[PDB]
């Protein structure tokens, strides 16, 4: 298919919601963070997500700390993850090179703050298909919100190719059509905007189910075949990485299956040696 | 509809099974039969894979032992239409035949036997020249099979067309071509079944089990209706059941939650 490319990976591990990362933040233990940055970059991450998950008054200093330790360790660009657009505004200048912003939506002033910040730069943006009413109730509302986001971005000269639209997959336990609806939203959005990226996290699909890792991995395989361009995930999860690379090969994107053969040769997938 | 599972383990190419048939170890065969049905098989494949002169007696033995253990119907697997003729009457109930194609006299022998019965048939998209070289030739051979079948009043519902997936390591469009053939076949014949084995996709690759499992997920999304597989592989069965839920076929994710409670999937 026109415009096929390897899945863009956003490495999720440097997030203060994870207890081990929360403690390293408290200590200014540069070592655990450096290491997460290195190992994710070595596993093929394209971006390193940084999320403070602290009290609001320590968020700006914590992001700045996480940013500095990541960038001392690796040139793989940052994904600045904050729910507070002001925090993103106050840390963007600490990045050595343009990356990804996680995220805007039509809620509040998210677009009004972040779009002028990245206008005229090569920063990219995740855009969630939700607004002041919360999570939309059907496919068509997601597609319409997508259109609204793209049009507001364009008013700041931000091209479709810089936007990763997240159409907000539902828990399969709450709606058995969750993936089917994800694929249909994806189809409509990419038809309207051929140069845009569609993105997702992998874990919301499996809430309320057992063996969540298994459900997440099959979601990833199917979402990829449905047209997903990027995802936020854990590239150090060796079974997930094996699924990801197997699917790439199966979708015809890994010439002679070399990438898969290698990751097997170098022991990055398969039984741990 | 839920993926139809043809349980592949009772096959004399597997050294423990070849041993069992030489020893007449009934217990091993009955165990494979029963556990495969418990794991959700809709059919139990039996394949002698002996010399041609012992094939008919070996199938008859396998069929007798399997049917002592389970009421799940048989899939009689032979490349010799005469062996299938000579054992069909040993089945207590109609099952599946694996397989016919346009080669030789496969259809001319097997279709009169199953005319007027409820036996189903696997039909491979190949002919006397061997494996087709493209998607269109597979699609045309499927149409030729359906027409031949219809001349014997065999409805589309009874047919499982196998469009013969090639190795991904030989052709990096293998899955994409399988999906396109499946799509066109199902478009032309919405009531037909599409079927495949899983192993051929992964020949020549490392971690074949991972490749095979991702193939199954993708193939299901493309419209595959049945597959010949090992339902005793707990990773593959978890993948299979997760994909059924993901494709909206498992009301309230019940079968998946059950299989995890009844410990058919997940950590032993």
From TrEMBL, chain A:
(6S)-5-methyl-5,6,7,8-tetrahydrofolate binds at residues 13, 81, 102, 166, 213, 237. InterPro entries: Dihydropteroate_synth-like_sf, Met_Synthase/Corrinoid, Pterin-binding_dom. (6S)-5,6,7,8-tetrahydrofolate binds at residues 12-13, 81, 102, 166, 237. The keyword Ribonucleoprotein does not apply. It holds the Pfam family Pterin_bind. GO terms for biological process: methylation; pteridine-containing compound metabolic process. Residues 8-252 form the Pterin-binding domain. GO terms for molecular function: methionine synthase activity. Keywords: Methyltransferase, Transferase. GO terms for cellular component: cytosol. Signal peptide: none annotated. Gene3D superfamilies: Dihydropteroate synthase-like. Belongs to the vitamin-B12 dependent methionine synthase family. This is Dihydropteroate synthase DHPS. It comes from Desulfitobacterium hafniense (strain DSM 10664 / DCB-2).
